[model samples]
Target: TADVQQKLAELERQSGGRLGVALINTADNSQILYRADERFAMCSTSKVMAAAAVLKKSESEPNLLNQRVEIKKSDLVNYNPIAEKHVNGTMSLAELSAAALQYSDNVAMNKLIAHVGGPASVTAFARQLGDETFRLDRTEPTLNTAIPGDPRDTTSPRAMAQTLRNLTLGKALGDSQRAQLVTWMKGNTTGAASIQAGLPASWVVGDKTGSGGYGTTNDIAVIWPKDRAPLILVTYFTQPQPKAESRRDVLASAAKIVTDGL
Candidate 1:
């Protein structure tokens, strides 16, 4: 563990921004925390919480996932890959959720939020999961708009790590629903350039990546190493270099520091 600590300290020094990381080993429930309580813009990582809210509500509304919704031009937002692919088409809630989780689709995320009632519903659901510092006051499209007084979604590394822990332990959703959530996360392709890049070939990472204007990049994941219990890792970086590739490399390096120690 000393090696991990030293490596993390060095990485922080070179990271070029405020950085936070939390790593939890399920085997012994041990954890490593570095500025874990500090808050940062969550960016698209808010989609994870939004999806969890819908999954929780689906407990009583069995047909929630099967419900199909029309995708209107008004629902589509710029810079969304999935929205661009499926504009003015129909997609079920389940399909939308998969797109949101797997591709970090902003349009799908906003639709899920609308289906769950609103930002308040997402806030309430996150509260139930024991995450006190997460706030989802804005939608995906507002992410780029310079709304002078609008609120942005935010969370700390510790809160996001705890949310992932709850989901892994079935504290946030039922066993079946949690598995479904993991399935979708593991299918994520957008984060391949982040934490997943630093992992062993045999290991699997179920993660969500978030990016925003002003060089914010983040990833929260449940990493499963072969023959080892899964670990939860959350990394947040703010004000990194303008290039997305540089931020992703920073995350990958941090992940490698933790994985090497494992």
Candidate 2:
């Protein structure tokens, strides 16, 4: 534990902005919350809620995932590199979910949110997971138009960690749907340079990443080590340096510190 604390101090010294972190041991419910009460912009990480809401709806709709939706160029309004590849094409709901989770595709996220009612539905599901501060009032395109102090998506580090814990324990979703969500997250390629970068080869991490204006970079994950019990880690860096890559390195270092201490 001392080792982890020292590493956290080092990370704090190196970080260019405010950082919040929460690490939880699922086996015993032990946790460490460092500035975890503070809320930061959720950014694309909010897609997790939208995806879960769709999954929850599928329970009654049955054919929800198979339903195809058209992705028009107008949907590709913001930071959606994946959707830009297919400006005007039809993809199944399942495919869009995967795209949103695995690649943090903005277009896919917006479409999924619309398909599953709206931002209210996603926030309602989040509240069920015991997250009261998580908000999703705007679409992906709004991220670009956001001003300082805007009421964009936001969540506390602890709330994000608890949401992941609920998913792992099958409280937020049914077993099959939970597994599906974790599968998609494990295949995620966007946050590779963040928390996952610090994990050992034997560890598996399922994570979602978020980035926005003011140099915000955040990651929330469920990590499984080779022999130890699984854990959840949520890290948020706000007002970081304009250069993003170095902040990721800081996160990786902090993650390694946490895992080593465990």
Candidate 3:
């Protein structure tokens, strides 16, 4: 454990002014290492909680998924100036959920937040999982201002590690539900440009990444199959421009170190 700490500390220093790392061994339900319990704002990685909330509700009411809700251009939130021009902006609840998890699509997530009962339900679900390190205050229509104000969605490495453990061990959701949820996460298309770059070619990683202005970037992932036993890795980096590159390096290096021989 001390060696692990030493490694983490060295990585933190190597972060070159941008990084927060949290690694967990889900099999053992232990936090392998961490930095900054209070360094929050893991960006879209917070979507994991929101996604869990939506699924839990869907489990309780099967009709929720079957409810064919319509999405329109008016429903889109924070559209990309250049990209939105080429794409038609509309989707069903299920499709939007898919986009949210897979692409970390802001518009899709914002729409789904409202469909999933808004910040209250999202926060309630996080609390239900016993996460106290952060609050869920950002919701559709208010995400921009809400993130900078009171009760913003905030979380630390320790809390995220615990949440990942809960998801993996099926403590937060039942067996079938857990399987369903992880399957969706496995389809995640966000942040692959960096996070899993160092793992074995055969190793599979289920992860989600969040990025925003001011050098905000984060990745949270669960690696798999059973021989690997799969681990949870969460890294957050914040600062300004090129600092984001430094953060990416920190995460890539850490991944190489921890997964070198696994």
Q: What is the C-alpha lDDT of each candidate?
A: 0.82, 0.80, 0.66
Residue range 132-157, candidate 1, lDDT tens digits:
89888878766522122234577788
Q: Which is the leading candidate under lDDT?
A: 1
Q: lDDT for model 1, on a 0 to 1 scale?
A: 0.82
TM-scores of all candidate predictions against the true structure: 0.92, 0.91, 0.84
Please give the TM-score that candidate 3 achieves against the real structure.
Answer: 0.84
Clashes of each: 0, 0, 1
The CA root-mean-square deviation of candidate 2, after full C-alpha superposition on the true structure, stands at 2.2
- Tens-digit lDDT track of model 2 for 17-105: 77788999877778877778877787777888899889888878888899988978777766677778777788889988999999988
Clashing pairs in 2: none
In TM-score terms, candidate 1 sits at 0.92
Candidate 3 stretches greater than 4 Å from native = 79-90, 140-151, 240-246
**Top model by TM-score, which number?**
1
| Cα RMSD, each candidate | 2.5, 2.2, 3.5
User: Global lDDT for candidate 3?
Assistant: 0.66
In TM-score terms, candidate 2 sits at 0.91
